[PDB]
């Protein structure tokens, strides 16, 4: 019995804090004797306390259409449990060498040390009988069960002043060339969602802390917007608005290539 860990694209879940990230979880079902019976089957993840409204979406069982009461999804604290039903155990031991999976998730608050890491388990056992069984409850605490590879999503903040003059806005594209050795100009996309919000504006005090971008993870794989080994990633910072009274540059005056890191002040001349 093993398990599988990987994440999402970030890409596809957006590469500010307030998005979401997603971890696809899987474990092979093994191949049971005709008399060997689940008393439990749960794949479990404590996220990582960066992670807020933890959960999980998705369950399935590879080559099968589930059904609602084929499992439960529950959160308690970080610890997300999917934990299937006898209906679901009987699926199961049905479908042995098939991948039982999940995806869980969390919306990320900030970045911190800069790295957010996951490992899920599988809690299951079996018993031999002559009839089959009613399901039990998985043990909260069982010792050493079968555990994941550890993946790891990287992050960094960012810290615009702009001079501090108030209400100058600001929007944060994705680079073209993300993991260049000197970030470049050239974007790409829509404007990035910071907690929701795509026009960032500065405060009294000239600042906009945004508390997380998205760098690199750890899963290897072509075209998935990503570098492997990466610590550091490029974005493109563009002023959509000046202060009060103030020269908002043109065209390429007004874009700023940033290089987020696991800050920067923009100057501006009175009219
Ligand atoms: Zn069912």
């Not at 919306?107 to 790295?115: F, I």
């Not at 990035?192 to 000239?206: K, M, P, S, V, Y």
Request: net charge neutral; glycine share 8%; with cysteine.
């Amino acid at each position: 019995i093993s398990v599988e860990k990987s994440i999402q694209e970030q890409k596809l879940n957006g590469y500010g804090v307030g998005s979401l990230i997603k971890f696809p979880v899987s474990s092979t079902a093994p191949t049971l004797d005709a008399k060997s019976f689940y008393k439990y089957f749960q794949l479990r993840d404590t996220l990582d306390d960066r992670l807020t409204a933890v959960t999980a979406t998705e369950v399935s069982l590879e080559g099968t259409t589930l059904d609602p009461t084929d499992y439960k999804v529950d959160t308690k604290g970080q610890t997300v449990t999917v934990t299937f039903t006898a209906e679901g155990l009987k699926r199961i031991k049905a479908a042995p060498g098939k991948k039982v999976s999940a995806v869980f998730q969390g919306k990320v608050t900030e970045a911190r040390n800069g790295a957010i890491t996951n490992r899920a388990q599988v809690i299951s056992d079996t018993v031999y009988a002559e009839q089959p069984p009613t399901p039990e409850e998985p043990p909260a605490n069982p010792e050493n069960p079968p555990t994941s590879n550890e993946v790891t999503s990287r992050w960094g903040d960012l810290l615009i002043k702009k001079v501090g003059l108030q209400g100058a806005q600001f929007q944060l594209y994705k680079a073209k060339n993300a993991y260049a050795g000197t970030c470049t100009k050239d974007k790409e996309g829509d404007p990035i969602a910071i907690n929701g919000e795509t026009t960032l504006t500065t405060d009294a005090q000239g600042a906009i802390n945004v508390k997380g971008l998205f760098i690199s993870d750890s899963i290897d794989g072509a075209n998935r917007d990503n570098q492997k080994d990466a610590t550091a990633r490029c974005y493109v910072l563009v002023e959509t608005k000046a202060p009060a009274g103030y020269v908002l540059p043109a065209g390429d005056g007004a874009v700023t290539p940033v290089k987020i890191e696991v800050n920067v002040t923009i100057e501006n001349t009175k009219q």
